[PDB]
Design an enzyme around this catalytic site. Structure first.
Site, PDB file in Angstrom:
ATOM      1  N   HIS A  93       4.749   6.142  22.003  1.00  0.00           N
ATOM      2  CA  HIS A  93       3.333   6.319  21.683  1.00  0.00           C
ATOM      3  C   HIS A  93       2.876   4.858  21.685  1.00  0.00           C
ATOM      4  O   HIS A  93       3.604   3.988  21.198  1.00  0.00           O
ATOM      5  CB  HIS A  93       3.131   6.910  20.286  1.00  0.00           C
ATOM      6  CG  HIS A  93       3.637   8.310  20.144  1.00  0.00           C
ATOM      7  ND1 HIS A  93       2.858   9.434  20.314  1.00  0.00           N
ATOM      8  CD2 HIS A  93       4.882   8.763  19.858  1.00  0.00           C
ATOM      9  CE1 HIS A  93       3.635  10.507  20.134  1.00  0.00           C
ATOM     10  NE2 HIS A  93       4.874  10.152  19.851  1.00  0.00           N
ATOM     11  N   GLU A 103       2.461   5.677  15.223  1.00  0.00           N
ATOM     12  CA  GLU A 103       1.835   6.796  14.542  1.00  0.00           C
ATOM     13  C   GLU A 103       1.980   6.570  13.038  1.00  0.00           C
ATOM     14  O   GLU A 103       1.034   6.748  12.272  1.00  0.00           O
ATOM     15  CB  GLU A 103       2.478   8.095  14.995  1.00  0.00           C
ATOM     16  CG  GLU A 103       2.414   8.254  16.492  1.00  0.00           C
ATOM     17  CD  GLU A 103       2.564   9.680  16.888  1.00  0.00           C
ATOM     18  OE1 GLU A 103       3.679  10.222  16.800  1.00  0.00           O
ATOM     19  OE2 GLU A 103       1.549  10.282  17.260  1.00  0.00           O
ATOM     20  N   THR A 195       4.377  15.457  15.973  1.00  0.00           N
ATOM     21  CA  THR A 195       3.059  14.844  15.925  1.00  0.00           C
ATOM     22  C   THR A 195       2.137  15.263  17.081  1.00  0.00           C
ATOM     23  O   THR A 195       1.059  14.715  17.240  1.00  0.00           O
ATOM     24  CB  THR A 195       3.151  13.326  15.817  1.00  0.00           C
ATOM     25  OG1 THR A 195       3.814  12.815  16.972  1.00  0.00           O
ATOM     26  CG2 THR A 195       3.933  12.915  14.556  1.00  0.00           C
TER      27      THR A 195
HETATM   28 CL   LIG Z   1       5.688   6.180  14.525  1.00  0.00          CL
HETATM   29 ZN   LIG Z   2       6.506  11.109  19.295  1.00  0.00          ZN
END
Ligand SMILES: [Cl-]
Ligand SMILES: [Zn+2]
Length: 257
Positions: A93, A103, A195
């Protein structure tokens, strides 16, 4: 379909996935002064010496490197876990700028990117069954900060051209995930969720305290990927991260003091 844009981003997910507003959602901010040191937590056992990577693909929201999980080749044990968890894939990410991308956050600090190594509990037989259990998955999270280059990440950085658009995949064998691990295995752990939709609350999160460094040129390459498929207007794949969710009735434990 869901995405990370103004019209289909994280704030809209609840409409199709009500669990988005659940009790054990991820990610969360890790408050280091409130995290409880738990001396009964065993050290992590990462056995990736027999790992077999197969391919890398752009799925429209990130790129995943997949591994052969038909046997106990690359496993995660110990720590807060019971039983053996098999590595099925890892993805990242990242942000459009170096000041965002992870995140999870530590004391509100956001990192440039996050590496998530996804594992599933072998007692459930297959990944599909595991995601339906409260202790089905174990995700090892590693933060990335911009600094010096990570040698072991380059093989992954060099193949990105081949999977620039959604749906593209390339053979990606003989990749050793051990080259992406920080020196220390100290961690924080709490019960949470995936997520990205379906956002199932089946994950035991294991977040490493020590981030690894990657060069700006390395992260720059991630930003050249596309959310769109070939022949569609170009949407750069950046900011594919979900904002922190309320901790609610959960305690984050630390394996170190
Ligand atoms: Cl993370
Ligand atoms: Zn992930």
């Amino acid at each position: 379909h869901w995405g990370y844009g103004k019209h289909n981003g994280p704030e809209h997910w609840h409409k199709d996935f009500p669990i988005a507003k659940g009790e054990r959602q991820s990610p969360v901010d890790i408050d280091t002064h409130t995290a409880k040191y738990d001396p009964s937590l065993k050290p992590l056992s990462v056995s990736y010496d027999q790992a077999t990577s197969l391919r890398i693909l752009n799925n429209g929201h990130a790129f995943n490197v997949e591994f052969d999980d038909s046997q106990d080749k690359a496993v995660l044990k110990g720590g807060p876990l019971d039983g053996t968890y098999r590595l099925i894939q890892f993805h990242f990410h990242w942000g459009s700028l170096d000041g965002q991308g992870s995140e999870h956050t530590v004391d509100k600090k956001k990192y440039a990117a996050a590496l998530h190594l996804v594992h599933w509990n072998t007692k459930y037989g297959d990944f599909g069954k595991a995601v339906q259990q409260p202790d089905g998955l174990a995700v090892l999270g590693i933060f990335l900060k911009v600094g010096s280059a990570k040698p072991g990440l380059q093989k992954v950085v060099d193949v990105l051209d081949s999977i620039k658009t959604k749906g593209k995949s390339a053979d990606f064998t003989n990749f050793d995930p051990r080259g992406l691990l920080p020196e220390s295995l100290d961690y924080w752990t709490y019960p949470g969720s995936l997520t990205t939709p379906p956002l199932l609350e089946c994950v035991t999160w294991i977040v490493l305290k020590e981030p690894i460094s990657v060069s700006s040129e390395q992260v720059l390459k991630f930003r050249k990927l596309n959310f769109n498929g070939e022949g569609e207007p170009e949407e750069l794949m950046v900011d594919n991260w979900r904002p922190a969710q309320p901790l609610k009735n959960r305690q984050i434990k630390a394996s170190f003091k």
